[PDB]
Design a protein around this ligand. Sequence first.
Ligand SMILES: OC[C@H]1O[C@H](O[C@H]2[C@H](O)[C@@H](O)[C@@H](SC[C@H]3O[C@H](O[C@H]4[C@H](O)[C@@H](O)[C@@H](O[C@H]5[C@H](O)[C@@H](O)[C@@H](O)O[C@@H]5CO)O[C@@H]4CO)[C@H](O)[C@@H](O)[C@@H]3O[C@H]3O[C@H](CO)[C@@H](O)[C@H](O)[C@H]3O)O[C@@H]2CO)[C@H](O)[C@@H](O)[C@@H]1O
Ligand SMILES: OC[C@H]1O[C@H](O[C@H]2[C@H](O)[C@@H](O)[C@@H](O[C@H]3[C@H](O)[C@@H](O)[C@@H](O[C@H]4[C@H](O)[C@@H](O)[C@@H](O)O[C@@H]4CO)O[C@@H]3CO)O[C@@H]2CO)[C@H](O)[C@@H](O)[C@@H]1O
Ligand SMILES: [Ca+2]
Ligand SMILES: [Cl-]
Length: 872
Amino acid sequence: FMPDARAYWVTSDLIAWNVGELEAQSVCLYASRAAAMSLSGGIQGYDSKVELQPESAGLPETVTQKFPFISSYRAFRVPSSVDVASLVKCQLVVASVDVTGLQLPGVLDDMFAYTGPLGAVFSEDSVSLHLWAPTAQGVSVCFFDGPAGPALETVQLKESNGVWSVTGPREWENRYYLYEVDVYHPTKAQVLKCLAGDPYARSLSANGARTWLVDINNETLKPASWDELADEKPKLDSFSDITIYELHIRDFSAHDGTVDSDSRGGFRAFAYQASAGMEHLRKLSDAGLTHVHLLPSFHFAGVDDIKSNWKFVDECELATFPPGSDMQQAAVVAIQEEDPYNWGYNPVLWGVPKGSYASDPDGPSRIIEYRQMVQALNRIGLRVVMDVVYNHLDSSGPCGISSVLDKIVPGYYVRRDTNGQIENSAAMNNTASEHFMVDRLIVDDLLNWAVNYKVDGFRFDLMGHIMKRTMMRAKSALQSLTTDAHGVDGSKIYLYGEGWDFAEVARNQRGINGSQLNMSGTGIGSFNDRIRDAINGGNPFGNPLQQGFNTGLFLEPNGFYQGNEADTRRSLATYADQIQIGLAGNLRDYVLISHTGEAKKGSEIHTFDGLPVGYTASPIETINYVSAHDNETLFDVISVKTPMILSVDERCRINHLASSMMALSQGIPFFHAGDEILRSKSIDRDSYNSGDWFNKLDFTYETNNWGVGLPPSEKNEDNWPLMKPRLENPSFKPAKGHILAALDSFVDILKIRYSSPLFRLSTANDIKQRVRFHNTGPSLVPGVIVMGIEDARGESPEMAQLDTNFSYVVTVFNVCPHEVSMDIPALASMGFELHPVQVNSSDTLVRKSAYEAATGRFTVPGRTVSVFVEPR
Ligand SMILES: OC[C@H]1O[C@H](O[C@H]2[C@H](O)[C@@H](O)[C@@H](SC[C@H]3O[C@H](O[C@H]4[C@H](O)[C@@H](O)[C@@H](O[C@H]5[C@H](O)[C@@H](O)[C@@H](O)O[C@@H]5CO)O[C@@H]4CO)[C@H](O)[C@@H](O)[C@@H]3O[C@H]3O[C@H](CO)[C@@H](O)[C@H](O)[C@H]3O)O[C@@H]2CO)[C@H](O)[C@@H](O)[C@@H]1O
Ligand SMILES: OC[C@H]1O[C@H](O[C@H]2[C@H](O)[C@@H](O)[C@@H](O[C@H]3[C@H](O)[C@@H](O)[C@@H](O[C@H]4[C@H](O)[C@@H](O)[C@@H](O)O[C@@H]4CO)O[C@@H]3CO)O[C@@H]2CO)[C@H](O)[C@@H](O)[C@@H]1O
Ligand SMILES: [Ca+2]
Ligand SMILES: [Cl-]
C-alpha cells in the first residue's frame, strides 16, 4: 500500500480534493496509527473512519490566497468529532474506487504554527531542547560524550502544541546529540524511527553526524575584540555606495603559497593579513570596493569534512598535458566526488559554518574561525555578504546523514506537486517558504548569521523560489537590529538575490514569489540579466557564438551567421538601448530615446521574450553584472565570442570595457572574483564540481588558468569543438604583464566611481533628472555609448549640489576598434577635462582622450572608456 497524495488537509476543519460532484457524495477519511491500511470495495485495516460532508461553499479566501494552485478544488468538512492532533500523526487516506493520501502543511500551520523557543536554550542552571514535530508519534534525545563515542543516555521529550521539549542540567552543555523521531514517512508508507540533527543547530561534528550542544554566546567562542566589531566596521552611508566582489572561500587560498599549507582553503586563510590574497583584497578595498560576497559557507553536502578522505589530482602530471586535451578533465572528474571542492549549493543545515572550511570539524573551531574571517575582512575595509540557499535541500526522506528537515516533519519543509511528489526545479527538494515554520526557520537563520556572526548582507540564491512575504519579513527583522540591543547595526544590512521566475512558482502559482518583477519597489536587489546579455551577447543557454555590444556584433563579425548587415546593426543598437536602461539603474520609468528614435520608458523596452527590460523602482534594486560564478568567466566569454584573430591585448581592453560599464553604472555593481585579473576556467560553463584545477585563482598573477585542458564533459562536451582551437592557440593566453595591467585598470575604474557621488545617485528621481544619453536614435554612431551626469551649476540651480569637485561628468564607452569623435553640441563651451585618474593612467591609450570646447567634441580611442569631468 503506497498511495499518492492528491488531497490536502488545509485547515483543522477542511480537506480539499479535486473530485467531481457525484464522487464528492461518498468521501471518507481513514486513519491508522500503525500505518496498517490496505485495499480490500473499500479501505481496510483502519483504526477509524469518518464521513466528510461536502462543503458546498468551497475553499475560503485564506486558503485560496495561501494555496492558489488548488483554489478550484472541492472542499470537504471534517466533523468536530475528529481529534485532529491525533490523526495527523497517523497514516491517512481519503477515499470515495479512488484512494489518496493527504498533504498536511495547511492544517499543520493552522493548528501548530509556533513562535516560542526552538533549538537549545541555555540558562544558568539548565539546558532545554525544543523541536517542532507535530506529526511525530515520539521524540527522544540521544546524548553522546564526544563526536565519536557511544550513546551515553537517551531522554524522552514531551509534546505540547506540536513542540517536543525537555529540560536538563547545565552539564548537558557541550554534549553531542541526535533526536530519535518516530514519524510517518509517506515515501515509505511506514512509521520510521529517524535519527536526526537539530534544524536549529549552531554547531555540528564532522559532516553533521551529531549536533554539538554549544552555547553560541560562550566567551571562548569570541575572537579578541569581537564585541567591539560594530565600531570597527567599515562605514556605509548608503546602499548606493555598494560594490560587490563574489568569491569562493576555497578558490581564495587553495593555490596561495603565501598561506601556510595546513591553512589553505578555508576560513583561517583570511586571518593572514600579509598573504597575497589578503593584499589583493586590500588593494581592491582601498580603491573603493565595499563588499565581498562569499559562496555558500553553511553546512552543505558534497564535500567531506574529514580531510583525511580528500583526494587530489597530480598537478605536475596534468600540467604536462596539451592545453586542448580532454585528459585533465578526465582526471579531475575521476575524483570530483571525493575532492575538497564544491560551490556548496547543497543545503543540509543553514545555521552552522561548513566544517570542511574549519581547521577541525569537531568542537569550536568552525565558529571562532568564521568570526575571525568576518573580523579580518572588516578590518581591511570590506563588509561580508553570505550566499544563502533557502530554496532547496540537498536531500529528503527518512534516511541518511544529509537529510535533516524532511526526516523530522516529512512532506512539510519541501514543496510538493499536486500528486504529492517533491518538486525539484531548484536542483532537488525545493523548499516551501510559503509554509509558516519554513518562513520562520529562514528568518531565524538570517538573524543568527547577522547577530552571532555579524554578517553584513545576504545574496539569496533562487529568490524567485522564496515567497515575497518571507523576503519582506526577513528584511524588516534584519534592518531593525541595533548595536545597543544586538551588537550590529541592522540598518546597514543589504539584501539582494536571483529573481528568476520559472517552473512551479511562475505566474504566482504558489503565492507572490521573489521574482524580478515582484521585488520591484521592495528595496531588495536583483541580478540584471538584461545588461549582462546585452553586453556579452546571446544568453548562457543559447548559441555560444552569438555576439553582443561588447563582443563584436556588427562591428567585428566573428563568422557565425547572425543575419544581414542591417539586421546586425539594428540588433547592436537594440542591445545598446538595453545597456543604457541598465546604466541608468534599470528603472521602469526612466525615459530613453530608443534606437528607432521613439522615446520609451525602461519598462517599454522589452526582452526578446516580452517582459520589461527596466523593472525596478530604485537603483538599489539593481545588481548590474556581466559575470558571476555561474556560466563563463568574463575573460572566457570574450574569448569565445570575439573574432578569433583579435590579439589578447585587444581582448584585455574588451574585458576592461565590460567591468567599466559595471563600475560606472547607476545601481550596484557586481564583479566576479577574477574579473580584475583576466580569470579563466578554460571555458568551463559550470565549474561547481570542477575542482581546484579549473577554478584556480592565482594571486601570483603568473597565470590566468586559460589553456589547462578542455573543461569537464558533463556540462561542456557539446561545445568542445569551439573550445579546443581557442585553448590550443598560444595567442589567446595572457601573460603576467596583461594580468597586472588588467588589475591596474580595474583599480582605476573603481577609483573613478568613488571620485564622484554622481555615479551613485540614490533615487530614481535623481537619475531621471541628471542622467542623459547622447548617442541615440536611428542614426546613432554604432559601438558608442555617451552618458552624461549633471550636477548643480550656475547661480540658482534647480537641483542639489552633490559633488564639491565636479559640476558634470561625461563617460564615453567606445567598443569600436578605432578612434571616434562624438560631437555633443549640448556640451559645447564647457570646462571638460579628462578625469585626473585617466590623465595619470598606466594605460597610454586612454591618455589621448580629448575634449574640444567649440564643438563639444569628445575624441576617444578604440576599445576605451574615457571619463571627462567639469571642474568646479
Ligand atoms: O546520493 C545521491 C547523490 O547525492 C549527491 O548529488 C545529488 C544531490 O545530493 C542532490 O541535491 C541533487 S543536486 C542536482 C543538480 O546538481 C547539479 O546542480 C548544481 C549546478 O550545476 C551548479 O551550477 C549550482 O547551481 C546553482 C547556481 O550556482 C546558483 O547561483 C543558482 O543559480 O542555483 C543553482 C542551485 O542552487 O549548484 C547546483 C547544485 O549543486 C547539476 O549540475 C544539476 O544538473 C542537477 O539538477 C538537475 O538534475 C536533477 C536530477 O538529479 C533535477 O532534480 C534538477 O531539476 C535538474 O536541474 O542531485 C545530485 C545527483 O543525484 C552526490 O553528489 C552524488 O555523488 C550522489 O550519487
Ligand atoms: O539548477 C541547475 C542549473 O544551475 C545553474 O544554472 C543557473 C544559471 O547558470 C544562471 O545563469 C541562472 O539562469 C537564469 C538566467 O541567468 C536568466 O537570464 C534566465 O534565462 C532565461 C532567459 O531570461 C529567457 O529569455 C530564455 O532565454 O531562456 C533563459 C533560460 O531559461 O533565467 C535563468 C533561470 O531559469 O540560474 C540558473 C539556475 O536556475 C547551472 O549553470 C546549470 O548548469 C544547472 O543545470
Ligand atoms: Ca567535488
Ligand atoms: Cl590534444
